[PDB]
Amino acid sequence: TSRNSGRDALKNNILAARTLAEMLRSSLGPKGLDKMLIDSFGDVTITNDGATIVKEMEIQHPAAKLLVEAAKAQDSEVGDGTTSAVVLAGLFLEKAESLVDQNIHPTIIIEGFKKAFNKSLELLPQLATKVDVSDLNSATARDALKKIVYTTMSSKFMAEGEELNKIMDIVIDAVTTVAEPLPDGGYNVSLDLIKIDKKKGGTIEDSQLIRGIVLDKEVVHAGMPRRVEKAKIAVLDASLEVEKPEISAKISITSPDQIKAFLDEEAKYLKDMVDKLASIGANVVICQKGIDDIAQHFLAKRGILAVRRVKRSDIEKLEKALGARIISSIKDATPEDLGYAELVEERKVGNDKMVFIEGAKNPKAVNILLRGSNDMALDEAERSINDALYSLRNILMEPYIVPGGGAIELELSARLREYARSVGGKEQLAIEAYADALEEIPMILAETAGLEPISALMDLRARHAKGLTNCGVDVINGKIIDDIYSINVVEPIRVTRQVLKSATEAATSIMKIDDLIAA
Amino acid sequence: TSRNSGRDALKNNILAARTLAEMLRSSLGPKGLDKMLIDSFGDVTITNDGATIVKEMEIQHPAAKLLVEAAKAQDSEVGDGTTSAVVLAGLFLEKAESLVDQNIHPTIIIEGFKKAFNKSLELLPQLATKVDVSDLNSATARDALKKIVYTTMSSKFMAEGEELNKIMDIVIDAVTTVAEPLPDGGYNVSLDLIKIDKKKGGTIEDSQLIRGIVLDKEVVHAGMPRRVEKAKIAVLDASLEVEKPEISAKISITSPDQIKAFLDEEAKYLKDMVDKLASIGANVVICQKGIDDIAQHFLAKRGILAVRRVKRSDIEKLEKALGARIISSIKDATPEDLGYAELVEERKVGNDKMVFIEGAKNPKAVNILLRGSNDMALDEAERSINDALYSLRNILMEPYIVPGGGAIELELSARLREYARSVGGKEQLAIEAYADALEEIPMILAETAGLEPISALMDLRARHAKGLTNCGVDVINGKIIDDIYSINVVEPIRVTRQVLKSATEAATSIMKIDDLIAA
Amino acid sequence: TSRNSGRDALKNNILAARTLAEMLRSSLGPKGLDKMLIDSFGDVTITNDGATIVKEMEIQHPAAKLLVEAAKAQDSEVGDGTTSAVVLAGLFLEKAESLVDQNIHPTIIIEGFKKAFNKSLELLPQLATKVDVSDLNSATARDALKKIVYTTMSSKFMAEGEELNKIMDIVIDAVTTVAEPLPDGGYNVSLDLIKIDKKKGGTIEDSQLIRGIVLDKEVVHAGMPRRVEKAKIAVLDASLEVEKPEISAKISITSPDQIKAFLDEEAKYLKDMVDKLASIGANVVICQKGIDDIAQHFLAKRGILAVRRVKRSDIEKLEKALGARIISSIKDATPEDLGYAELVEERKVGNDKMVFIEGAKNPKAVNILLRGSNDMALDEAERSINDALYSLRNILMEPYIVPGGGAIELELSARLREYARSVGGKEQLAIEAYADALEEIPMILAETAGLEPISALMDLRARHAKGLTNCGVDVINGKIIDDIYSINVVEPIRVTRQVLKSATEAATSIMKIDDLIAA
Incomplete structure (x- = not known):
């Protein structure tokens, strides 16, 4: 029976979970770098899918097994967010560890991250964008539905495929015909x-x-x-x-x-x-x-x-x-x-x-x-069609969309670095680390695109300060963009909401474990 | 489970796929040097077809398995282009490798090889000379057909068989009538x-x-x-x-x-x-x-x-x-x-x-x-007879020819190094490294023929600079030549178009990958 | 002859000057822990002065020798500042190593510290307090002078000497008569x-x-x-x-x-x-x-x-x-x-x-x-008598005094984290890490007194914000306290101005030096 000291066990668990996260992060964006996966049978498999690299690899450190288990539990709702969810989890952990290093009790850190997340869920329905429950039988003059299918297809692959896109837009129109409605503003449509x-x-x-x-x-x-x-x-x-x-x-x-x-x-x-x-x-x-x-x-x-x-x-x-x-x-x-x-x-x-x-x-x-x-x-x-079906079922089953390209996050980082000032003793240091952790998402996208990440993070911040939520950076453009709503880069609310639940779950769970006994 | 680092892996995977290429290129073209290949069971095979040498030899390091997969797929279409295509993929990987040493993000290189390639596909029907669909029947006073049936035999052999050639030319004539012809200079009678x-x-x-x-x-x-x-x-x-x-x-x-x-x-x-x-x-x-x-x-x-x-x-x-x-x-x-x-x-x-x-x-x-x-x-x-049917089939399904001996490549290199001028930024270095790679094909032919390569390039460049779409080096002749059409060194379009299609495919895919995980 | 790499060499010369500072800091302030220093001839020597601990010890690495020279030069002007000054140089350096890790060029970090320092100099006359220029015919009903001599003894001793302290007060009163009148409203008086x-x-x-x-x-x-x-x-x-x-x-x-x-x-x-x-x-x-x-x-x-x-x-x-x-x-x-x-x-x-x-x-x-x-x-x-005379000659030769107990420092840090809002670019990032470094002074005095440092900094930060200037932490009382003037912890302007002058010099100096070639 293999024993482990306290202090040491948490550091050893933050490192496994953290090693998984920084290894997945070269594959984060929508042009993200593809992994190569060899089996003991010697067959090679090249993908950028993040739920596929966790399944394909021998992982054994117990805290690395928890972080895949979180990814796996997330993998049924999303394909891209479950990628993003592992990266976020990893970036929260390396900030928590810096507070533990000032000898601050993890109990307090857990309680100040709990208040952060909670503030965040009351800012995302106000920061959200609301569209019609029915654009003239919900699908007429096409507009919204075409942009979600042209966008989702460009984000997941790009290249050539316009004669594929129009057919996929017609299919998406035919499912939209099916749809019968909920008195809230969602719908009773079902993938199943x-x-x-x-x-x-x-x-x-x-x-x-x-x-x-x-x-x-x-x-x-x-x-x-x-x-x-x-x-x-x-x-x-x-x-x-x-x-x-x-x-x-x-x-x-x-x-x-x-x-x-x-x-x-x-x-x-x-x-x-x-x-x-x-x-x-x-x-x-x-x-x-x-x-x-x-x-x-x-x-x-x-x-x-x-x-x-x-x-x-x-x-x-x-x-x-x-x-x-x-x-x-x-x-x-x-x-x-x-x-x-x-x-x-x-x-x-x-x-x-x-x-x-x-x-x-x-x-x-x-x-x-x-x-x-x-x-x-x-x-x-x-x-x-699957990737396009799933974006339609997320806008149909909840009418709220939020802007993408680093926007949502930058606003939580500025309202949380305002919140954390009205906050009292040792709870404020945890909260302001969670506000910085959203700022650690966003810029990595600009480095994926081949552009300097830190000057792109500051110029989005000063645009965010004189203007409003509008600004962001586009991997597909390669540049900072005035207005995200203009380039079609709205996202379902549910891709955020789930990755902030599963990153704050994985990181609080690795914080909560002070000992490890192995047979 | 063998892990490998990002950045580190990209260099190791170019080396492996560059090493394979750099071993095979001495067997390129009609004087190229033969390999000897001994199996596990002990069977010796002396050959110089290049798709055959990769089939017959064990390859283990995954990025050299990727170039083999490019060979494999091209071997279903052509038997001659596949030899050339593996070497071509080496000449693109070694200009990319210098750009990786200058720290230029692969996303940009991937996209510049792409803009250079897109330009090239629109330069290769203007560089092409198109003969006839069948005015007075194809093979009548035989000529063009006799030229491909004598030219293929010179490449594939280079020894006596004048009394074999008249018979092959006759068999080709017989096949050529059948035809079953398709619109706009196509034909439907084929190998299957x-x-x-x-x-x-x-x-x-x-x-x-x-x-x-x-x-x-x-x-x-x-x-x-x-x-x-x-x-x-x-x-x-x-x-x-x-x-x-x-x-x-x-x-x-x-x-x-x-x-x-x-x-x-x-x-x-x-x-x-x-x-x-x-x-x-x-x-x-x-x-x-x-x-x-x-x-x-x-x-x-x-x-x-x-x-x-x-x-x-x-x-x-x-x-x-x-x-x-x-x-x-x-x-x-x-x-x-x-x-x-x-x-x-x-x-x-x-x-x-x-x-x-x-x-x-x-x-x-x-x-x-x-x-x-x-x-x-x-x-x-x-x-x-097969080899002669395959040239006759590349000529039947498009009646387009392109000058060989380095004429299409040396002409793309000057037209790309004019294009790469009108493009701005560090993406112009990227267009200009693909023009440099076509110029890296060609001079290798002059050395395989037993001549100095760098002086043969300068002679080839100057005849290519005072005239227009003419001059080459011919391995059979063992000289440089003003009139490369005239000594019959012209190629069907489909052996060019594909090998430049399968070298950009292989090299673009070897660039996109940052991880290699092995059981 | 030993050579050293770019950036490496720089990190090692930051590491030697860091180790000196963080070792000299355990002796900081008037509760500071004393060192024991035994010589090569065996002579035992116990002191807590920092200009002595650098003198009575052999310091080997050239960048650590440079820091003794910045200490030797400062000891000739003041006997309190040179202790504080060693510690201040390490705390700017350990923020500099974080920026260098951010992959920021030293030329931009140096220029932002220059702009922090010029902003700081226009902040030390505004925070500065002038009492009088002539004080009812000077040392009269003595009061202000009694207080600086009794305070300078209480920091320098903290045990019975009341009947010396009173004598010291008559002697200071005697030297004050001597002092001759400047039209600034200073006094010419000289220790020589x-x-x-x-x-x-x-x-x-x-x-x-x-x-x-x-x-x-x-x-x-x-x-x-x-x-x-x-x-x-x-x-x-x-x-x-x-x-x-x-x-x-x-x-x-x-x-x-x-x-x-x-x-x-x-x-x-x-x-x-x-x-x-x-x-x-x-x-x-x-x-x-x-x-x-x-x-x-x-x-x-x-x-x-x-x-x-x-x-x-x-x-x-x-x-x-x-x-x-x-x-x-x-x-x-x-x-x-x-x-x-x-x-x-x-x-x-x-x-x-x-x-x-x-x-x-x-x-x-x-x-x-x-x-x-x-x-x-x-x-x-x-x-x-020496030390108290030295405190009179500094109040007399400049008629400006400043608060103490980490008041000036906490006030520079907050005014700079507002300056840094009106600044742009990567020199803004550098100003904001210097401002943070001033915040690293101050809370270490509360640890010598046994208080918790992160809790003494949150109570001072909220009191300096909701309250108003002259808030500090007294190491001799052992408390956070409002109106530190009341406690009598006012310093000459020249002991602060110099210790910022010599720290900003040592840190710029180890930052301008790329290489180290040693025989």
Whole structure:
């Protein structure tokens, strides 16, 4: 059992967490420097994604494991902020450590950072920008929605891709149509209710939203109906497979006719099962855990359109949208538990076959069909719609946006270095370190762009002093910019709010740990 | 888990990828020096193709694995450009490396190589000379084609074969007619529609084009037809073989009659299979994964010509030209699925048998039969034919040529060093280091030819300075030359355009990376 | 020969001058911890003066030697400031090392300290207080002068000496009469004209100012007048000694009588010289490099009081006051080169003999006579008189006084962190780190007294802000206190002005020096 002294243990934990942070920080910006990641299997992986470098690397120091655990817990809400969140966490820790070095109790530092964060959450709804809950059915004369998709695409990659951007703006318009509203000013839109299916080949301009369901399956037998009109769809949980007692009958393999007599006995049990489904009057069937080949001939003969591996999430929606009820087993199929579609057809997308389900009693869920060239251009175009889907769902589910390019932070740093003056003993030194820590974000972006960082930090400060919140620095420009609102660089409120929660959580947690005992 | 520092890693990853390049460049061009490559298993291989030397050699340090990935991707498109492209990537990395020593942020270098490159792509169709689409047919009084077929042979070889060259020039002529032409000086007949079969024995002059398809896999038994007139061809995917249950029926060895009856029951399943075919009335039959021995005897008894092991691609052409169906299995065969040939014969090439299907409506794919010599002299003559088809294909899909021997590069270097003047700031040093790198190609050619390089540059610069888009150095000649068109040293555009595309890709990617993390 | 790198060399010369300062600071202020210093010859020495601790110790590194030279030069003007001055140089330097770490060029840091210092100089007349220029006929009902002498003893001692302190107050009152009036409203008075003579074997109460001069000496032979009335004083540069030629006669040991006759010739020239002085009619004579015993026997016979060893400074104060002429040698003694005194007498002080010259036309110089007990208690009563006289000569030669207890410093730091708002660029950044360095003085005095420094700085910072100027921290009381004037902790303007002058000199000097080449 490995022991560690106090003083020493906190310094040793600030260093691991701090080593992770300054290592992620070459990759912080929207042109940030890409990492190279070799596995023990020796495959190389080059990315600028920050949630991917924590997952891909051996980390073992317990305080470095806490900081990835914070990143991971953050990784489900955001892709860029979870990068920014680790950098911020690291910059708070190296200021806390300077107060501990003046022998100041960490308890007080924790309490003065708690009052800082708290002041900050009452300044960001006033420092925020409020847009319309509905620009003429929330999407007309396009404006806002186009800038979020042109911006998010430029920030995540840049290069060439205008004929991709316009299609992505049309998709984003189609999701915006879906949307039904909350009396606050948010919306009841949901990523989860959105489902995106990608098919190989041709043009990205041929991608569309669907109100009903698309099944990406190619559907089992060529002889089954290629259109069904007024379809009664049965959904069944189990395999279409024989039901038999567990302990298994034995015949000799040294008699020929009996190997055929087990095989034919199980095969007349399947032909019974298919007759029960054609007696039920089903025109389509879904079976989630498989259909035998003999049974697929008998379903095709009786004229029934059968689907295999339709995954649990897609079934819940098909149930819910056509009014089915999930049936456990083929004896258990029963004639009013069947749901209903106007039609079910097979349609080719990019030469490949595909089943589109429509005429649906309620589909809350929607489907987007994405057709396009190759694999790298298709995977990348899906990813790109994803980044654009997620910015739209953050402005839809909360109407407030805040300016970016170092703005928000510089204002907290000046109101907090005004707050911290009215504050009393030993609490004021902690608070004024948290005001400086927001000032340590912002300038690093200007160094990423190839420009001096310290003269860019002072000139934003004096612009912030004579003017107001407007000013900032743009990595994509390479320069200080008069007015951030002008270059489209508004950000969702939720990318700030979460990284100030997860940086103040990771740093207060490394401050709160005075000992470490290891087996 | 091996860690490495930022800034430190960028230099180590340029060195590694610069070292690879600097080892391969002595093998560049038509006198370049050969490497010897010994495998782990001990196999020695002496070569000077550059895509082959990276395939055959172990590479371990990740930034030299990246340049190999650039080689790899270019090797799918060209065989000649890939040798050049790896060296080019070295000449760009060593000007970038000096800019990193002057402390100029990579974001700027990345962007200046980019502005230099964007200018170059708009200088290379104005530097290009465009010949003809096909006024009076392409190859008539042969000339331009004869020049590429003699010029490719000079590069790829440089020894006697005047009596090989007239034959290659003739084969090229034959291919060139086919064409299937595309708008605005394009063409559609290509490498994946060209098929070359080489058969031993006698002269290369006996080589021919075929409009139909040529099958190398022999007609089987002697007692089958060796010529079919007005042939009914059946095409079949599956093996002609006995199909039977999973768990395998057993009849004891110590009942010796009943094993013999089990065998003859399986011979009655085979003779049935053949008798179905003979009932369909297919005078020819093909089975892709095989014909049974009994089954080959019955097809011969009935007077049916059967072919075995024919490859997926050859089958598709044979489908398309005879109007046939690829049938799944003897059970799937049914009486509208048969194609049609005016004749089918077995014809002897250097004594040996070969099956030619011909008189086939509407084929786009062609077959070239190359007869000749024993074996080493025939594999080199097929290879020589390939090399001549690839120049003829770079000329067919764009009828654009660019002067070689350093003419396009020395001309981009002066036009970029004029462009780089009109650009301001430290980004002008960046444009001007990419003009310096093209001028770093070219003089290396003069040293490989056994001449002083720096004095050859000054002679080349002065003829390039008093005239315009002319003069070069030629490794074959072993001099400098006023008239570089005139000695036939001109290149198709697609070998330039790609190797300058794949050197900027590789070098731009090796710059963006600041970390390397290894398990 | 050892060489050193740029920036490295500079950091090492900042490290040596830092270690000196932060070691000299444990002795700071009047509660300061004393050092013990043992010499190479083993001599033990205990002191807390900083100009002594640098003298009694070997300091090796050249940049630390430079700082002793800045201390040596400052010790010659003040005995309190030079201690404070070492500490002030280290505290500016450790802020400079942070700016150098910010990658700021020294030329910009030097120019911002120059602008901080010129701003500081226009701030020290505004903070400055002028009491009077003449104070009811000066030292009258004494009050202000009583307080500076009692305070200077209380900082210098802090134990029983009340009945010396009162004597010291009479002596300061006596020196004040002397002081002559400048039209600035200052007073000309000079330490080079103040003289104190200490005799063992009494009580302090019997100490006096004298207008005329005191000769400390016992004055040679008792046989001469021990009181002279209307004294004609001869002053003589040389020895009363033979003038015989250097290339000189010799005499044999065995010619016994001629040896006695050479001895009597050197005594008969000395007796002529003495008779020559006596014909001139002199009554006192001073010979500064000596009196022969024969010349003393003969000078007492003529009723003449001769003095030996009267040093060159004392000799000028006696010349100017008696209207004498310093004569070179007895041959040059001549009758009107004599000065005149009303009387010259011997008076017994502490039972010890002492000679007083008085009735002097126009002396500027004064003499203070110091009686006391023992030897150690007399040297200390001398030292106590010294330091208080030194505090009078600084209040008298400039009529400006300033507050103490870290009042001036806390006030410069806040006015500069307002100056620095009207300044721009990287020289603003440098001004604001100097301002911070003044804030680092002050709180260390509260730690010598046992208080908490960060809590004594927050209570002073809020009291200096909500209250108003003359706020400080008293190390002798042990408190933060408002109106430090009340406590009597007012200093001369010249002890602050100089200690900022010499610190800003040492720190600029170690900053202008790039290299160090050492043999």
